[PDB]
Design a protein around this ligand. Structure first.
Ligand SMILES: *[C@@H]1O[C@H](CO)[C@@H](O[C@@H]2O[C@H](CO)[C@@H](O)[C@H](O)[C@H]2NC(C)=O)[C@H](O)[C@H]1NC(C)=O
Ligand SMILES: O=C(O)[C@H]1CN(CCCP(=O)(O)O)CCN1
Lengths: 50, 48, 48
């Protein structure tokens, strides 16, 4: 239940705003406010060019 | 903005103007931008 | 029909109306809920 790391700092107001390459999760959504993303990502697969 | 319809559902981009006028939620679908042409039928040009 | 080169303006489409409406948070809730069940992939396999 207790958040740690960057999320923990934001929850405990130690870090006001957050900066980092962290994706969007529902658990974080309930404890912080997710801003508009600046780049996209997701479940991707990489294969050898061959 | 005139109050005719309540909620909008449509694939509309989010520029600065309408964002200033009204806020938006998370983007349900990512997208990019591309030119489209009806290719070309492969043909070798030469006389004889 | 053929697409171009590389795509540009890597944007997103979501949903937003007048500011008198906290429904957009539930919209984000629904999009993440479908992220947790694979429903946009259902839409993709149906349409896209
Ligand atoms: C919008 O999302 C909010 C966030 O939860 C919803 O608010 C809940 O409303 C239900 C009943 O509709 C209550 O049982 C919960 O206690 C509420 N949670 C909180 C803390 O807000 C709401 O249902 C969603 N849509 C509406 C109707 O605004
Ligand atoms: O939000 C975060 O915590 C980071 C985490 N990164 C996880 C890397 C994938 P996996 O967890 O190792 O399978 C992705 C970028 N955002």
């Amino acid at each position: 239940g207790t958040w740690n790391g960057m999320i923990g700092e934001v929850v405990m107001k130690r870090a006001y705003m957050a900066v980092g390459s962290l994706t969007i999760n529902e658990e974080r959504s309930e404890v912080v406010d997710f801003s508009v993303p600046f780049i996209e990502t997701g479940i991707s697969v990489m294969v050898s060019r061959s | 903005l005139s109050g005719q319809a309540d909620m909008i559902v449509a694939p509309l981009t989010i520029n600065n103007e309408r964002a200033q006028y009204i806020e938006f939620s998370k983007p349900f679908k990512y997208q990019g931008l591309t030119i489209l042409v009806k290719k070309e039928i492969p043909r070798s040009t030469l006389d004889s | 029909l053929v697409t171009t080169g590389e795509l540009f303006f890597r944007s997103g489409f979501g949903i937003g109306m007048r500011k008198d409406s906290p429904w957009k948070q539930n919209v984000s809730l629904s999009i993440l809920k479908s992220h947790e069940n694979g429903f946009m992939e259902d839409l993709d396999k149906t349409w896209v």
